Amino acid sequence: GMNPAYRKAMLESEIQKLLMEALQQLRDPRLKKDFVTFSRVELSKDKRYADVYVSFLGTPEERKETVEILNRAKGFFRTFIAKNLRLYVAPEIRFYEDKGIEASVK
């Protein structure tokens, strides 16, 4: 096309589908998967962290609840990526309720 690549967004798009297949196989206590997606994914400088933007299709009050269910499910997600991604350990999959907002990291 007309724009840069740098092996960033392509890799994040590879991780994007992985997390969705994992979600379809998560089963969960009560996550209405029909009312969510994982759209934006952005990995860190040294790819040691992986920021996953979760867009719930409920109210914002409900949307918050889903993030703790996701953060419980972290190990199930991250182990699946360690099947596919040839590296020793995998990034910290930090789930967020779709918050691209420049100020913080923590």
Coordinates of N, CA and C in Angstrom, one line a residue, residues 7-8 11-12 15 41-52 74 78 81 85-96 105-106:
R7 N 7.2 -4.8 10.9 CA 6.9 -6.1 11.6 C 6.2 -5.9 12.9
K8 N 5.3 -4.9 13.0 CA 4.6 -4.6 14.2 C 3.1 -5.0 14.0
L11 N 2.2 -8.6 13.2 CA 2.4 -9.5 14.3 C 1.2 -9.4 15.2
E12 N 0.8 -8.2 15.5 CA -0.4 -8.0 16.4 C -1.7 -8.6 15.7
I15 N -1.6 -12.2 16.5 CA -2.0 -12.4 17.9 C -3.6 -12.2 18.0
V41 N -4.8 -4.7 19.4 CA -3.7 -5.4 20.1 C -2.5 -4.6 19.8
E42 N -1.7 -4.2 20.8 CA -0.4 -3.5 20.7 C 0.7 -4.1 21.6
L43 N 1.7 -4.6 21.1 CA 2.8 -5.1 21.9 C 3.9 -4.1 22.1
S44 N 4.6 -4.3 23.2 CA 5.5 -3.3 23.8 C 6.8 -3.1 23.0
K45 N 7.7 -2.3 23.4 CA 9.0 -1.9 22.9 C 9.8 -3.2 22.5
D46 N 10.1 -4.0 23.6 CA 10.8 -5.3 23.4 C 9.8 -6.4 23.3
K47 N 8.6 -6.2 22.9 CA 7.5 -7.1 22.9 C 7.2 -7.9 24.2
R48 N 7.8 -7.4 25.3 CA 7.6 -8.1 26.6 C 6.2 -8.0 27.2
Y49 N 5.4 -7.0 26.7 CA 4.0 -6.8 27.1 C 3.2 -6.8 25.9
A50 N 1.9 -7.1 26.0 CA 0.9 -7.2 25.0 C -0.4 -6.6 25.5
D51 N -0.8 -5.4 24.9 CA -1.9 -4.7 25.3 C -3.1 -5.1 24.5
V52 N -4.2 -5.6 25.1 CA -5.3 -6.2 24.4 C -6.6 -5.4 24.7
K74 N -6.3 -15.0 32.1 CA -5.0 -14.7 31.5 C -4.2 -15.9 31.2
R78 N -2.7 -17.0 27.5 CA -1.2 -16.8 27.3 C -0.6 -18.1 27.0
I81 N -0.9 -18.9 23.2 CA 0.0 -18.2 22.4 C 1.4 -18.9 22.5
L85 N 3.6 -19.0 19.2 CA 4.7 -18.2 19.2 C 5.9 -18.9 19.7
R86 N 6.9 -19.1 18.9 CA 8.2 -19.6 19.2 C 9.0 -18.5 20.0
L87 N 8.8 -18.4 21.3 CA 9.7 -17.8 22.2 C 9.6 -18.5 23.5
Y88 N 10.5 -18.4 24.5 CA 10.6 -19.1 25.7 C 9.3 -18.7 26.6
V89 N 9.3 -17.5 27.1 CA 8.1 -17.0 27.8 C 7.3 -16.1 26.9
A90 N 6.0 -15.8 27.2 CA 5.2 -15.0 26.4 C 4.9 -13.7 27.1
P91 N 4.5 -12.6 26.3 CA 4.3 -11.3 26.9 C 3.2 -11.4 28.0
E92 N 3.2 -10.4 28.8 CA 2.1 -10.2 29.8 C 0.9 -9.6 28.9
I93 N -0.1 -10.5 28.6 CA -1.3 -10.1 28.0 C -2.1 -9.3 29.0
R94 N -2.0 -8.0 28.9 CA -2.8 -7.1 29.8 C -4.0 -6.7 29.0
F95 N -5.2 -7.2 29.5 CA -6.5 -6.9 29.0 C -6.9 -5.5 29.5
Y96 N -7.5 -4.7 28.7 CA -8.1 -3.4 29.0 C -9.4 -3.3 28.3
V105 N 1.1 4.4 31.8 CA 1.4 3.0 31.5 C 1.1 2.2 32.8
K106 N 2.0 2.3 33.8 CA 1.9 1.5 35.1 C 1.9 0.1 34.8

